[PDB]
Structures are given as C-alpha cells and as structure tokens.
Amino acid sequence: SGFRKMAFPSGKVEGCMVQVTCGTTTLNGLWLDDVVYCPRHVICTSEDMLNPNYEDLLIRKSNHNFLVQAGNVQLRVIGHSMQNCVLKFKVDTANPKTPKYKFVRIQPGQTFSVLACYNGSPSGVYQCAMRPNFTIKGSFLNGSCGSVGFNIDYDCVSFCYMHHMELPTGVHAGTDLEGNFYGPFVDRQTAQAAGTDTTITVNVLAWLYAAVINGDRWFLNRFTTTLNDFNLVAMKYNYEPLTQDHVDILGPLSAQTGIAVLDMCASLKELLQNGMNGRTILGSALLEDEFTPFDVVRQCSGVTFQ
Amino acid sequence: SGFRKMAFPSGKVEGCMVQVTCGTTTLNGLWLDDVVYCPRHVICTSEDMLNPNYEDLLIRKSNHNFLVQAGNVQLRVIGHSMQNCVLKFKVDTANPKTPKYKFVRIQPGQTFSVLACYNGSPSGVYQCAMRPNFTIKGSFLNGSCGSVGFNIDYDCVSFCYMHHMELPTGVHAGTDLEGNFYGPFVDRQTAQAAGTDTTITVNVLAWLYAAVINGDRWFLNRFTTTLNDFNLVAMKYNYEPLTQDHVDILGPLSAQTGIAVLDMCASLKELLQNGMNGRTILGSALLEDEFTPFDVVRQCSGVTFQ
C-alpha cells in the first residue's frame, strides 16, 4: 500500500539525450533513429530572443555550424530543417538506443514524466501535469531547454513535451515534438499571458478514490449531488467543469470502492465549501490534482513496463 | 526556476533488476556482476512467514530450487548463500549491464530514489527519506519486495536500500545490501512497533532556503534565537534536535541567500506555533522534510550524472 507521486523509469529516454551547440548556445536534443530534435532558439543569442526572426537567423547557418554530441561521440550533421519551433537534424548514424516510440499531443490535465537534462546529461526525473492553461510547474534552470516529457506503455515511449521557455511568472512552456507550442505561447522573451489556472477536477476525484483505497476516509459524507449542482460549486472555486466523460473514466474506481461518483462529488463539494479544517488526506493538506484516474489505477495494481 | 521532488535517473538500476521465483513466491532481485541479491523470505510461503526458521528453511533448498529470470533470458544459478536477511545467488553470467556501484548504509534523514518493481520489471521511480524511526513511507504492493533504493554520484550508483516488509500499520521496512535491517525490524509477519516518528529539522530548513531561492520569502523575519532555545520549541512539536553539525551543513545555502542559519531557525520557530494560515510555501500547505541540504543544492545548481 501507500501512495507516491511516481515517475516512469527513465532508462529508455536517457539513451536518447544529446547535446546540441550552435555558436555560444548549448542545450539538449533528442536523438531518435537518425534525426536529432531540439528547440529552434538554439540558434539565438540572448539579444536575439528579445525579437528573433528565426527564418533569417537560420539562413546564416550551415550543417557544420551545428555541433551534436551524444556522450563523447560527435554526430555528423548532413541536413537540417525547421518544423514549427523545433529544429530537426539529419545525422550520419541511427541511434542504437532508439526505443519504440510515438509522438503525442496530450490534453490539458494529462500527466507525464520529465527527464530534466543539462548539456545532454540527465539530472533528475519527476512527474507533472499539463495545467488547464497549458503551462507546467516544472524545475528548469538555464540550459535545461530541450528536456522532454514522456509516458511509457509497456515498451513504447510516448513523447509529448519539449521544454522551451520560462515565463516571467516562473511557470514553464513548451511544445510537442512536432514543435507546436501548448497554449498561446511563442519562443520570444516577452511578457506572455497564461490563462487563469484552474484545478483539474477529475484528477482530484481520482486521488480521493486513491485515499479511500488506502484507508483514509474521514471526508466521506452523508450527501449526494447532481452534475449541474456540482459544477455550480466547481465554477465558484475555479475547478474545471465535470462531464459525463469524466464520470465514465472514474467508473473502475467507483466499482472498487463501492462509492458512486456523484457521492464522491458531494464529499468534494463539502471540502471546497468547508475547507479541510487543518486535516490531511494521503499526507497532503491541499487537494491534489496531479494524478489521473489512470495513474491511480496503475499505482494500485502495479503495472510494469521493461 | 521551480522546485520539485526529483528522483535520480534510473537507467543504471533498471538494467540490474531481475525476477526471482521460489515455488509459489516471486519477488525482485538485483543482478550485479555474477551475483543476484534478493530478500531471504523468497523461500517462505505465507504460512512460513508467521515464524520462520530461515536456516532450516534454506537447508530444505538446493541451488536448483531457485528460478531467476532476466527479461526473457533464464539465468543459471550455480550456488546460493545467506548473508543476514538477503540471499546471494551465484549465476552463470556476469551482468553486462553492471554499472559502477557501491553498497552504502545510510543515516536517518538522508534521502534516496526508489525503483518500484514487480516480477523483475520497473514500474515507477520516486524520491523518499529514511524516517528518524528507520521506516520509509513508500508505495509498495505485493510482489514489490526486493525493489531497491539508491543514490548516484556522477557515474557510481550507491545502493542503500532493499525493500522487505510492509508493517501492519502500512509503513515499509527493509535492509541495506548486506541484509541488515534498518531499525529494530525483522522479516517475520508479526506485529512490530516502530518508534515515534519525528520531523527531520535540518531538511525543513534546507527546504525553506529552497523557497527563498525560488522567490517565496513571506515567512522571513528579523527575529533570532540561539541553537539552545530553538531546540526547546523544536520538540514540543516533535522536531529532531538541531546540532552544530546541522548548522555547518546549511552553510552554503546560508551564504547563497544572505540569511544566517540561526535567523532561518527563528523563522521556523515562528512557523511552528502559529501555523501557515491558509498560506503555502513552494506550493505546499505543510512543512516539507524530504529534501536534504545536498538535495536542494543539487537541484538549484543543476548537477548532472550520465
């Protein structure tokens, strides 16, 4: 038993991290088959990022201006192209560590693991969520750009995130592996508005179910509610609205615990209106929204990968 | 910027996890050079666990009574031996994936990454602390035994923990890689008492320094205290005593932030008696004690490994 914020094992991703250098700028790239992917602002100086013309900056660059290093190995660059906000390098050698992989654009509220990297070398792994306003609250210092987020299904790595930007507010923004930003952000050093950040309601409910499975039950109440009644409360507390698709996803947890989804919504409603009275749930004094219903099921059945 | 509970990259350890079966009981083992390590209770049935005589139970067994699977390949056991509470299996093949490694017995309050495993396959990775009462609060379902905890220093994996036991209270207990239990626990399915758990004070202070570095400063004040009066308040709230060794450890964080250790303790003293109201620190409503001072420095300067 017990419940932890768990990341996927990162071995398959470590073998794809490389260092990309262009002039004075070095950041992380992703080496799969014979292509290397990296944020396009590798071609920028600090002064360029205030207002970069990426097409005009890239035209000054040839294949040999890009230094791609995998461990101690130099890769030979034999072609380059810009796809949205990522650069793709055709190299001499296919990565022999290439796992089975897919590229995926995830939805707000989904979770993924982040392998934070500096100079092509892994530093740490953690789990996090795509917020409803398409930012993530990560841990990224200077040089972490090009670090990637992923999920794993058995033997297949689903890449869903490449880090590009810290916003002046301190939250983080990036792209999918086709180089399209999540959200309205651009790769430019300017003030950029993220939306109001709301709480991922279906995830909070999944974690309440996890709590009941682990013996933590003080918040279960004598009330029920309706979807429309709950959503009126949800809107007041900046919770995302709950839909029947969400109720359906929670089905298996409902069946295991014997607690109907609308009954657990009434417990959540009462927690939103009355607070937690200084009490804790699964060791947390706040309502946690970084576990998907799938995350909760995985942890409570012990699903592996290798 | 940003601050997260990061685990070490787990690739070096994933390549050492095997599956060990003995009759009806399967758990995880660690394959280093030509040896597989695993908990000795793999030779127990559920009934045996109530009162095992391990020497007698092991004598009933021979080198071929053991069943070691690595991925799909079967390993050939040519020998076995019992070192304290671990079994040492001599196999035919040295693990070609053996990393540079060390066995280490850690101290209470130190932290490590756990690779949670089932049937020899990694499921997830998370960071945790050895509590002052020598338990850990992990996420361990049936079959996770033999999962290991580790740290990484550049290129050398320091193995410090192997999971053995879930206590009746739902916390976890295990050994070092020589098979000596942390704490007063034994590999027998009985009621077992763990000490009163205290909060790791030096870690809470480290995390407050992390919060300042990251722009969260509201809890600061121009009060003070000496070491001796802080400790009067410290327990009274079940906090571990602070020693000069601890003040010395926090020196570099003190120098980076311009906040004297004793002044940070005076901020903690104030926090313990009035709470945090509805206010948070680094997104948390409680005081966090699973970051060591070394953890904070690692994350804030971006130390890599590869």
Numbering used by the authors:
A (entry chain A), B (entry chain B): 1 to 306
Study text:
Mpro cleaves the polyproteins at 11 positions with a consensus cleavage sequence Leu Gln | (Ser, Ala, Gly) to release nsp’s, which are required to assemble the viral replication-transcription complex. In addition to the indispensable role in viral replication, SARS-CoV-2 Mpro also plays an essential role in escaping antiviral defense by cleaving host cell proteins.
Crystal structures of 11 Mpro mutants provided structural insight into their altered functionality. We employed crystallographic structural analysis together with a high fidelity FRET activity assay by our group to assess the functional and structural changes in Mpro mutants. Also, we observed that the charge distribution in the active site changes quite dramatically even upon a single substitution especially around the S3′ and S2 binding pockets. This might explain why with most mutants we see the changes in binding affinities and not the kcat values.
